[PDB]
Design a protein around this ligand. Sequence first.
Ligand SMILES: Cc1cc(C)c(S(=O)(=O)Nc2ccc3c(c2)nc(CCCCCCCN)n3Cc2ccccc2)c(C)c1
Length: 278
Amino acid sequence: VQGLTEEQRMMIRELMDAQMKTFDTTFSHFKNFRLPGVEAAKWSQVRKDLCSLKVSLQLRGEDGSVWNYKPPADSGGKEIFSLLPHMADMSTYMFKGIISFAKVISYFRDLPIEDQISLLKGAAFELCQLRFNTVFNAETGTWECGRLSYCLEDTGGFQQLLLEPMLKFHYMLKKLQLHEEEYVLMQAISLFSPDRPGVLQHRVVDQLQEQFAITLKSYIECNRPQPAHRFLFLKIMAMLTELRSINAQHTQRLLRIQDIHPFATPLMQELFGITGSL
Ligand SMILES: Cc1cc(C)c(S(=O)(=O)Nc2ccc3c(c2)nc(CCCCCCCN)n3Cc2ccccc2)c(C)c1
């Protein structure tokens, strides 16, 4: 609010507006989702890949009842896929919110439709993880999604869990104690990345991204004088670069698992380049 130009203030306001309209932070409208039921070299890697998703799951009913699901151990069989349909439904729900976020923003609406599609295919996973970070509780290792909770299982210990790049990302980013405004500028910087596959208006997207980055740098300078926030802008940009690498690693996991055991919803297939033809 302090020290920004009028264009920078309008930019933050437009992003905060889009975030408010399209982020169901209580997950009140996530419903009707599936739940876990009550050569060989490709299989060996798929087994390791699925370790990237292993969480337990709690559901608190409006009546006060609690269901809890603890996932199995890997015993060399199909039981390792039990959480995939639920995870697909959750990600699909998040992805719809992300697509709505982008479409409310003026700078995005003004790009040609092909570049909108390419930008969303490139960034949807990243914006999803940024939104999930805001409901991550780093004290209990839990993503608190309203009536749903997804909890990390104690291995090993805390430091042995933070070796997994996705978890180190979530814990390190939560430690920065970002404002809502800083999360939503992070989303814009990731969304308007000019080097995503298939982008045509590289120069326009690059100039938009740079403007979002300058606004973030200035927001931090004007509102965060404390020695703990020295280099905060550069810390955030380093997190964004690391998030891009996690996106490539986790996208290849999805594709290997999909090859052995189909689970991607139609929206996930569209976002991740699955044509529907073998
Ligand atoms: C295989 C696959 C790949 C991709 C690319 C997708 S996805 O982007 O479409 N979606 C998606 C959505 C949320 C995700 C996610 C993927 N990975 C994680 C990290 C899981 C936590 C570490 C476990 C620890 C064990 N060592 N989270 C966070 C999370 C937040 C809330 C609830 C649960 C998990 C999918 C579906 C599968």
